[PDB]
Design a binder for this molecule. Structure first.
Ligand SMILES: [Mg+2]
Ligand SMILES: [Mg+2]
Ligand SMILES: [Mg+2]
Lengths: 197, 176
């Protein structure tokens, strides 16, 4: 497994700088990344595989935090897959402001979040731009970067103030191309032989 | 989630192939009481800055996990749990505070940074514990404060009091 040519990046407001995030099963992610990761989108919605899970440290144990995820474009291109290669075949079709996925345990104390793995498996991806279930909407054959966001409560431990602050974190190895069906046989194979079932 | 004049910023790791080779073996960095420079040295090209407003460039070195490591039978392994994972000290780049175009004109070198194993060091060197894995981090602050941070995972390393791997100590030129 190569490492991604892009550094991990993070944007952090004061009060968040002690926090650290660790990608669960990073090597597994590196293998898909190496090949070029694809995620299937349907009208009903598909969960991601591999699923995005993180261990968090450095949270204030009884400050309240909101954990959420969004999936933003990584570039402005359409792609096609021919001759076992991804090529740029034109300009990305600008779309929705990205929806959020909020972790269902939010709001919660740092103690709660640090106690185990924050998992986002339940997050679903659709191609339907009229989705009525608040699923994340994506464009087939476009590249996307998942982002972690952590929101901290204020002194009264309650959001709605301007004394809230956030971490934003990006693992490059979790980037992927959305697809209505798999293109690279290696992706299709990695998923069958890593299928946790 | 509006990052300020900062979504455009990109960072590029210098002499990266060397970091990759060394990362593939398992990067080791010797720490001493007087303090050792990092090898490989840490240098980056910075792009996408507001051409000239004042920025401050920092580096910290933080735990990449919580394990203690042993090196046995030509291999690293987990062996226990580390001591403290922060609060730590920083290296503030000497050119700081300075301007975007300035920062962008020549490679930003962190070569003067040193690593010591003396918990009572008076020279501002970064204090590490041997046989613990660490992760160099780059922090950028535009002069209510906010950090853009860049982490190159291939610069992670285990801190040692002397080189361990025979692939380093018995360096084979036409091999690895
Ligand atoms: Mg010495
Ligand atoms: Mg030296
Ligand atoms: Mg020595």
């Amino acid at each position: 497994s190569k490492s991604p040519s892009s550094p991990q990046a993070a944007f952090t407001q004061q009060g968040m700088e002690g926090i650290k995030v660790f990608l669960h099963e990073r090597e597994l992610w590196l293998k898909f990344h190496e090949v070029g990761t694809e995620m299937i989108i349907t009208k009903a919605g598909r969960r991601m595989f591999p699923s995005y899970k993180v261990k968090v440290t450095g949270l204030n144990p009884k400050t309240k935090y909101i954990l959420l995820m969004d999936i933003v474009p990584a570039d402005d291109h359409r792609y096609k897959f021919a001759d076992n290669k991804w090529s740029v075949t034109g300009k990305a079709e600008p779309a929705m402001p990205g929806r959020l996925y909020v972790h269902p345990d939010s709001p919660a104390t740092g103690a709660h979040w640090m106690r185990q793995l924050v998992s986002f498996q339940k997050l679903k991806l659709t191609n339907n731009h009229l989705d009525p279930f608040g699923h994340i909407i994506l464009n087939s054959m476009h590249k996307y970067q998942p982002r972690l966001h952590i929101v901290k409560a204020d002194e009264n431990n309650g959001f709605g103030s301007k004394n809230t602050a956030f971490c934003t974190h990006v693992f490059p190895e979790t980037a992927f191309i959305a697809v209505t069906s798999y293109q690279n046989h290696k992706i299709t194979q990695l998923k069958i032989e890593n299928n946790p079932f």
